[PDB]
A paper describes a structure:
The circadian clock of the cyanobacterium [name] can be reconstituted in vitro by three proteins, KaiA, KaiB and [name]. Homo-hexameric [name] displays kinase, phosphatase and [name] activities; KaiA enhances [name] phosphorylation and KaiB antagonizes KaiA. The crystal structure of [name] from [name] revealed a hexamer in the shape of a double doughnut with approximate dimensions 100×100 Å, whereby the N-terminal CI and C-terminal CII halves of subunits are joined by a 15-amino acid linker. Two phosphorylation sites (P-sites), T432 and S431 that are both located in the CII half were identified in [name].
Numbering used by the authors:
A (entry chain F): 14 to 519
B (entry chain A): 372 to 519
C (entry chain A): 224 to 297
D (entry chain B): 446 to 504
Write the structure that this text describes.
Amino acid sequence: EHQAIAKMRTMIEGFDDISHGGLPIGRSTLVSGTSGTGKTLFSIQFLYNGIIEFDEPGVFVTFEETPQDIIKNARSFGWDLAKLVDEGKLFILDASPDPEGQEVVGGFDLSALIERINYAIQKYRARRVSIDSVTSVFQQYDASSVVRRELFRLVARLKQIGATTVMTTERIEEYGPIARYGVEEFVSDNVVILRNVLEGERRRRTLEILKLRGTSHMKGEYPFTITDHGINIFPLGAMRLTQRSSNVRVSSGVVRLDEMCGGGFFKDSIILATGATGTGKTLLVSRFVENACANKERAILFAYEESRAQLLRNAYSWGMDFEEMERQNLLKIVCAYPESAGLEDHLQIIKSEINDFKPARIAIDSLSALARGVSNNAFRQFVIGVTGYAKQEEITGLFTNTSDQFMGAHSITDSHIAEITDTIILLQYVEIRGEMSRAINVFKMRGSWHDKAIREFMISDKGPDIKDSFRNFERIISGSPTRITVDEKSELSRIVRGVQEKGPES
Amino acid sequence: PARIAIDSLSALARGVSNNAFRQFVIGVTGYAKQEEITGLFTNTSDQFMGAHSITDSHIAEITDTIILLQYVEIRGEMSRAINVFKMRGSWHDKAIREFMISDKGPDIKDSFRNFERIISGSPTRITVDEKSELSRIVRGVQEKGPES
Amino acid sequence: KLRGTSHMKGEYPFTITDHGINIFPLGAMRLTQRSSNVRVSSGVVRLDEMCGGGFFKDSIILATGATGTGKTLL
Amino acid sequence: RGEMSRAINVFKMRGSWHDKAIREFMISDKGPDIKDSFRNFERIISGSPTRITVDEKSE
Ligand SMILES: Nc1ncnc2c1ncn2[C@@H]1O[C@H](COP(=O)(O)OP(=O)(O)OP(=O)(O)O)[C@@H](O)[C@H]1O
Ligand SMILES: Nc1ncnc2c1ncn2[C@@H]1O[C@H](COP(=O)(O)OP(=O)(O)OP(=O)(O)O)[C@@H](O)[C@H]1O
Ligand SMILES: Nc1ncnc2c1ncn2[C@@H]1O[C@H](COP(=O)(O)OP(=O)(O)OP(=O)(O)O)[C@@H](O)[C@H]1O
Ligand SMILES: [Mg+2]
Ligand SMILES: [Mg+2]
Ligand SMILES: [Mg+2]
Ligand SMILES: [Mg+2]
Ligand SMILES: [Mg+2]
Ligand SMILES: [Mg+2]
């Protein structure tokens, strides 16, 4: 690896990518952020992993939290630190103040702490260190001048010592000054900023690497989530464009359609269903999950519009028994509101559900549902998200988008995703003689030939019936077409008088 | 209640942010869907005739079935029209029916079948020789049959 | 923050009434809405015919239209 | 016909029945004088009408 600084892996989902390999050995990273941002966890996880994966003991210096609690809380993610503190793989160093204390102690004890830590490290043979909340210490009676010289001592000696330290820091505003005394930012080799931006009452946490003296790293903010497994990051930009492509084809669940698509959809591909409300996207999706089951392959449906109940109701009335799909262990419906958490979260649930079920097909009914409230950029970023996972995992995907203006919409995107999509499916209304008929259309397929016809279609208990095209109509797309006839009566089956039978006999 | 109705959620959307509104909706929608309550909602499209969208803030999505009304300017007159736009679990009529309004209520008559561009409020009457083709004078190929 | 555990993240609108603080986790509520093929009239016969028998009971029907077309009526 | 003529219409009344046609009308020193609807025109609403001049049923 071409970098000039030897880094050490945190084993934290996404960090070592963002930090181009992890924290530089022998230096110190200032991970700081507001309140409830992830700070201590990040440090805890940092020590942990170095212990559960490299057998590198580590010293943890707590300043405000109690040595008991640090163990109490760590269990939340399933970590028995007590067991590690026991096996001497993790020494916790308690420097918390006292409930019956005096007043005055943050300088010579700083000369003492260095010596203290030097003992732990020397005794436990530690290779990693985490000082949590240094801030609280100066928080006795100090200003920027005593902070730059005092930290520095620590860091520096720690560096000589040869320990790869991590320091936490608090900071009032989310975007203003990195740290409190606005000084910790320059004494450190590396600075990591955790944020919990508000915006629209929801909450988006992000992690960012302002600086790594000596190497390069991923720039700007990257969204991470805190699960029962700790921090988890999405380098939604370190997502290289190197997924596999196969001319393989699969069923849509509608046979006349498969024709319209040069012989069925492509396996490695992104399918986009767009149409005004009530046209039938939802449907095509169903017949898509269904068929993936009628072929003994797994697939998941993530509904953000209708319930797991109602999704089954309309599915049966359309034929296809979803009840069984569930039992046969072939189809799984997720179902959830977009307002039940910001994108970063959703994007993960979806991934989650794709690793615990390994589907070979996946449907997301109404991406434009998730676009509720969210700023395009944030949506477009999430769209590249899902899309990007399903593309490097041989997991055909059918996204549904509902257009905000029926009849007369000049773009089947509204959010402008029509470039991420490999193949688009188009549904829309057609006012034909006072009636609201639907018609489908295959707008684009990257590798196939597909049918250029705008065939009309009708729905029955049976499904999407693909009929013929309005050859005798101008201004189709317009919603309310114009009738111009050169024929119509032309053959096809002229012969007048008695042509039919009735129900008795034929 | 066994049924619930809110006249003009568009009456609430006054002032308030879109997001708040959209949220409010889920806020009354889901509570109705779980509580076994059949609910009907009222929305006033800001522009009469031409309306390329049926709601405003884009609520349609959190809806099972749509019943819409839209004036149709016919022969110098402002008349009504209703149409079940979409129904998720049912069949429902595709045709756009006109309707009167008197002392007994609504009488959904026929759809303007001899018209074009109805969704636009101002249609294009197009009878000019109805479906009987230019063969209304049956050519005269029918001058063989009657003799003496 | 609730060190040690999880929790719902974001703001939630609560109302201080005559029954103390009331919060509405508008996101919490799940998408597990029971359903049935049960239909119900509207008050307009023909209308029910255009729907397919009537609006289902467990449903959300939206009556949209310009001002004056008769949503109130319906 | 190249002229800016008027029109009046009771768009909606909540109790009554009110007239459904768009009646033209002119202004004189005697005040408004409502007239007859443009029965034979199209796109009245838009403002820029279009006469149908439908050739009857063409006999
Ligand atoms: N299992 C878990 N699943 C989801 N979230 C969790 C879990 N455990 C803890 N959290 C969340 O992690 C956060 C805890 O933050 P942490 O104690 O690690 O340090 P901090 O917020 O950076 O600093 P401070 O000591 O000032 O709180 C809380 O906001 C909490 O909601
Ligand atoms: N049993 C049925 N028989 C005949 N037509 C049906 C039946 N169920 C639904 N339909 C038709 O299909 C439409 C329902 O649309 P669908 O459920 O496929 O999803 P959508 O239009 O993509 O999205 P959304 O319904 O959320 O707006 C109705 O508008 C209706 O015309
Ligand atoms: N007794 C009646 N006879 C004939 N027409 C009536 C009668 N009452 C009301 N109307 C008509 O019905 C319409 C009244 O609208 P309605 O009360 O149904 O509510 P809306 O159209 O949904 O909303 P809004 O009243 O604010 O426009 C009027 O436009 C009018 O033409
Ligand atoms: Mg905090
Ligand atoms: Mg902490
Ligand atoms: Mg749907
Ligand atoms: Mg919808
Ligand atoms: Mg009104
Ligand atoms: Mg009203």
